[PDB]
Amino acid sequence: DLYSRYKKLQQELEFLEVQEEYIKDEQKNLKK
Amino acid sequence: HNMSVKAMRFPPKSYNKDLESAEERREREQQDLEFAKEM
Amino acid sequence: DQTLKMIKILSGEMAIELHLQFLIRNNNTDLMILKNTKDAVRNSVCHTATVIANSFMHCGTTSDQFLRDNLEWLARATNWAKFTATASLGVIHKGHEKEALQLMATYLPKDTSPGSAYQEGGGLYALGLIHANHGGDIIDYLLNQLKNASNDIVRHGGSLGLGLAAMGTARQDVYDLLKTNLYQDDAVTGEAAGLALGLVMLGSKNAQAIEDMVGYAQETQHEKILRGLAVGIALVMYGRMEEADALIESLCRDKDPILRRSGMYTVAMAYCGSGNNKAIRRLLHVAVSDVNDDVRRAAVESLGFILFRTPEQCPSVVSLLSESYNPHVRYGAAMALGICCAGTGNKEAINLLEPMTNDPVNYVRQGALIASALIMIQQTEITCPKVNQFRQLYSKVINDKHDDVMAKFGAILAQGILDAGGHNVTISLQSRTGHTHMPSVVGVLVFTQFWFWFPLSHFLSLAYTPTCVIGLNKDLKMPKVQYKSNCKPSTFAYPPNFQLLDNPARVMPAQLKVLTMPETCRYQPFKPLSIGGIIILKDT
Amino acid sequence: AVDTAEQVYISSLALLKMLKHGRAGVPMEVMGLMLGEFVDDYTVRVIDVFAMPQSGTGVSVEAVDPVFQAKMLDMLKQTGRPEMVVGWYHSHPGFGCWLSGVDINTQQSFEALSERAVAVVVDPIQSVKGKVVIDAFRLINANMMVLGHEPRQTTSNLGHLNKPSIQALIHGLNRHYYSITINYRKNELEQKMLLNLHKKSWMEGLTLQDYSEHCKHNESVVKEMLELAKNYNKAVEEEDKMTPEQLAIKNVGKQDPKRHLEEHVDVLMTSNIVQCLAAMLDTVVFK
Amino acid sequence: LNAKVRLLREELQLLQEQGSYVGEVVRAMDKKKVLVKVHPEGKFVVDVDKN
Numbered sequence A: 001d002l003y004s005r006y007k008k009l010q011q012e013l014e015f016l017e018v019q020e021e022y023i024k025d026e027q028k029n030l031k032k
Numbered sequence B: 001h002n003m004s005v006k007a008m009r010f011p012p013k014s015y016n017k018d019l020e021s022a023e024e025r026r027e028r029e030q031q032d033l034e035f036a037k038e039m
Numbered sequence C: 001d002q003t004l005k006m007i008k009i010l011s012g013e014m015a016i017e018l019h020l021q022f023l024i025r026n027n028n029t030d031l032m033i034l035k036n037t038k039d040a041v042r043n044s045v046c047h048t049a050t051v052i053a054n055s056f057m058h059c060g061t062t063s064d065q066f067l068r069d070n071l072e073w074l075a076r077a078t079n080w081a082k083f084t085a086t087a088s089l090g091v092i093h094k095g096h097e098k099e100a101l102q103l104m105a106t107y108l109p110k111d112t113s114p115g116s117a118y119q120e121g122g123g124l125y126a127l128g129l130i131h132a133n134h135g136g137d138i139i140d141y142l143l144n145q146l147k148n149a150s151n152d153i154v155r156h157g158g159s160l161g162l163g164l165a166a167m168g169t170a171r172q173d174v175y176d177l178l179k180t181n182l183y184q185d186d187a188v189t190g191e192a193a194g195l196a197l198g199l200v201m202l203g204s205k206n207a208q209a210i211e212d213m214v215g216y217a218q219e220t221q222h223e224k225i226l227r228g229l230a231v232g233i234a235l236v237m238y239g240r241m242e243e244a245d246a247l248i249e250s251l252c253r254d255k256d257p258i259l260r261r262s263g264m265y266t267v268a269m270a271y272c273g274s275g276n277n278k279a280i281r282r283l284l285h286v287a288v289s290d291v292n293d294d295v296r297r298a299a300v301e302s303l304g305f306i307l308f309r310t311p312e313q314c315p316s317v318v319s320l321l322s323e324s325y326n327p328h329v330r331y332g333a334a335m336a337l338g339i340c341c342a343g344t345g346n347k348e349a350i351n352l353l354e355p356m357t358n359d360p361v362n363y364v365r366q367g368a369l370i371a372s373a374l375i376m377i378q379q380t381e382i383t384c385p386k387v388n389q390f391r392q393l394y395s396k397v398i399n400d401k402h403d404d405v406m407a408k409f410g411a412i413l414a415q416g417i418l419d420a421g422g423h424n425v426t427i428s429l430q431s432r433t434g435h436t437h438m439p440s441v442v443g444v445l446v447f448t449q450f451w452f453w454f455p456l457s458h459f460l461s462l463a464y465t466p467t468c469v470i471g472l473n474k475d476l477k478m479p480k481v482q483y484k485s486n487c488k489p490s491t492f493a494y495p496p497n498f499q500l501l502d503n504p505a506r507v508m509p510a511q512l513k514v515l516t517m518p519e520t521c522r523y524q525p526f527k528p529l530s531i532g533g534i535i536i537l538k539d540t
Numbered sequence D: 001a002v003d004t005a006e007q008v009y010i011s012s013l014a015l016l017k018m019l020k021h022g023r024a025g026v027p028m029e030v031m032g033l034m035l036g037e038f039v040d041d042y043t044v045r046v047i048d049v050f051a052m053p054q055s056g057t058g059v060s061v062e063a064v065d066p067v068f069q070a071k072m073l074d075m076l077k078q079t080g081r082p083e084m085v086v087g088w089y090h091s092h093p094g095f096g097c098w099l100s101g102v103d104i105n106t107q108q109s110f111e112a113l114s115e116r117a118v119a120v121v122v123d124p125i126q127s128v129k130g131k132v133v134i135d136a137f138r139l140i141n142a143n144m145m146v147l148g149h150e151p152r153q154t155t156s157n158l159g160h161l162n163k164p165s166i167q168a169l170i171h172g173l174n175r176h177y178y179s180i181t182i183n184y185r186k187n188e189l190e191q192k193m194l195l196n197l198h199k200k201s202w203m204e205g206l207t208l209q210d211y212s213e214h215c216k217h218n219e220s221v222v223k224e225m226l227e228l229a230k231n232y233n234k235a236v237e238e239e240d241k242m243t244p245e246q247l248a249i250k251n252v253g254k255q256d257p258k259r260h261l262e263e264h265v266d267v268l269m270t271s272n273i274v275q276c277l278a279a280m281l282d283t284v285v286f287k
Numbered sequence E: 001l002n003a004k005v006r007l008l009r010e011e012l013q014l015l016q017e018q019g020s021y022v023g024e025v026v027r028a029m030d031k032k033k034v035l036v037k038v039h040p041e042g043k044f045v046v047d048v049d050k051n
Helices: A003-031 B002-006 B025-038 C002-011 C013-025 C032-038 C044-057 C065-069 C080-092 C097-107 C118-130 C137-145 C152-165 C172-183 C190-199 C207-218 C223-235 C241-251 C257-270 C277-289 C294-301 C311-316 C327-340 C349-356 C362-374 C387-398 C409-418 C438-448 C454-463 D012-024 D066-076 D101-113 D142-146 D166-170 D188-194 D213-237 D257-285 E002-013
Strands: C425-427 C464-466 C469-472 C533-538 D007-010 D031-037 D043-051 D087-091 D118-123 D133-139 D177-180 E024-028 E033-037 E043-047
Touching (some): A003 C311, B025 D166, C032 C409, C065 C080, C080 C097, C080 C454, C097 C137, C118 C137, C118 C152, C118 C454, C137 C152, C137 C172, C152 C172, C152 C190, C172 C190, C172 C207, C190 C207, C190 C223, C207 C223, C223 C257, C241 C257, C257 C277, C257 C294, C277 C294, C294 C327, C327 C438, C349 C362, C362 C409, C387 C409, D012 D087, D012 D118, D087 D101, D101 D133
Parallel strands (some): D087 D118
Antiparallel strands (some): C425 C464, D031 D043, D031 D087, D133 D177, E024 E033
């Protein structure tokens, strides 16, 4: 099936963006 | 300068090693503290 | 006729009877472990932990041998801890309502009225342990007892019993009584009243009730009342999705930490199982942005409730947060990992939890041990090689006197929950129908709030779901049929590859795909095979 | 009986008063009494404290002196403050937190007057820029321990978050008295008021300094920059002629230009940039 | 960064332990025994750690 590949790609993109965001926040707080 | 610092941390990799002081020394320290307190 | 269909479907007595029969017939547990561990008890914490483990180990088996024979050890408890003992009586006698009242008057000396009245008040709460959802007029009977308002302990016990027994009744009288009790301004009974108000209004989403509760909690002199009301105001608006958002923005701005924690609980409960990006992003940003500490634990722990539909997603994010600087984040991550994938013994969470088992902080070790126990409820040694290691680790840490208290409290709770229900029950993170189970979610939330009051631990029993296969040919008489497995006996070993199983024989969730239908037998299943639950087998 | 979840709430003014009073009399043990209320039997609030006259030539003062205490109590009421005393406090300079032998007898009087008092101990010289050392204690009786029972029945796990120090264990502590948790109540008004410290007027941010000392400072800095520049290559050349295991120890007695030049660069850039920008906007703010 | 911060806190914690003397060894013995002499006291016969 090909639909699952599509949905998995969107899920991975969004989830990686969220991870990147809170890692940036972590790096900001650590020096403080 | 900014470019240089942008090419800084590429070569480091696989540095998961994180040990602070020891593994079983905490038990020895606690035992010594308890022995000192008892005396 | 229609009367029998109503009795079977609406009353639900037949389902409870079948579950009780499955639990009683297939009750397999080792009683020597409790006897061995009792000899190491030398503190009130150890006594309470042992009572909790004994109650959790024989849930629904109606076997009170340990409590009856060890009355000398049970007499050591006193004051509010004694009330907890009453809750134990509610664990063994789950169901079997026809004798519940006769059991209560058998054990609770209400007419005697001893010097310690607590042992009576908790008895009311014990009623909630029996009547899970089919309260009926008996629940109304509690409304009589709650009318006494003799003292704070009695009122608290009555409120807890009424809230537990009549969950979701949405009765107006219960809401009025809860509002009056909250307005009574009592420092010891107010928490139970708030819990009852939160429980008895589940799914109502009444704007007036929520506004009144928020106004009452905005101005109160007792911290206990605020902490009790935080979970009630969170639970009153369960799983309504964006409808809850109007409240959330209000609770994420209050300077009071308890209100922020309540907001985190509301976010977690209103987005159960839905992979929202915004909800996860905000719930995880709060866990690093705010300056307080308890709200960090709440925010980190609340992620577990919203990833249980995709169990293989938690280790992707909390792995980096597990080694944070402060122990609160570590405890939250460990407990979230334990609570998310509790349905099955995942082989990825164990490697993450292993380093936390010997962390310098004691309470993070206790949380990690509880998470490890809950993540691995119904596994075998062949499926996962961590059974023997973790069992012997629990045994070794529970028998060493040099460890501090609550370091082994998690261990004894782990030993009690490992053999829960005689291995005839399991965690209920996801139901067989693909929908979230309200009693399991409520029990999980109550267990997550165990840091504020120990006597609230027993509510975890609301998340236990039996794991057995029952086939019938007649609604009143059970048939004599056989079922055959297809795998080796080692994989399906209980606590040749064609083993025969009877009509009420239990089968593990991981070994339910190798069951063979008895084609040779005359009886045949109307519903499809290879699925759990009670099914009617047509006779041919 | 009593539980381990008992809480005490200390305001900001009380903390600062007691800290200043304790720091003033560093070589001896000063003492005073608190005041507040018991809203319930889980939390005790203290709202104000006051010092008391002491008898010199010693390090301990008996708390029995009714005239001063009575006068202060009946005089504070005339301007609000209807509260009552809840306990006493004294300071241990550089020792720690515990109750000496005489302290049990001293707190026995307050226990007799009211069975639910508390003793607060503050360390004035072991605290710096945070982590003020303050502890709170209550006494126990040995007859109840003879009965094979222990006080402070435990109902939750929020009472064992801090492990006691070894010096507290060395003295009496758990075999003579029990410590209780502590908390500080904060509100928005006083916190917003308190952050005005070290704030400067609008005049200090528009002065552009003298144009004569600035060039002297730049000239001074440039010469040491030159000398460190000359000394850099000598250390650069021999960076690998010696085994790196002793490389770190080689820099234990003499300075290194690499670390010792960056600070020069930073201060110089900051001063020049800010001095330029100030004049830049000032040329047009005024006429 | 997180490793640095945690190491700093633990380094603060572990500075309240006793020091260790320095001494001169004269000669060893059998079954892990040595004889040493530290100047502000006499001669001590002691054992050796496992490493």
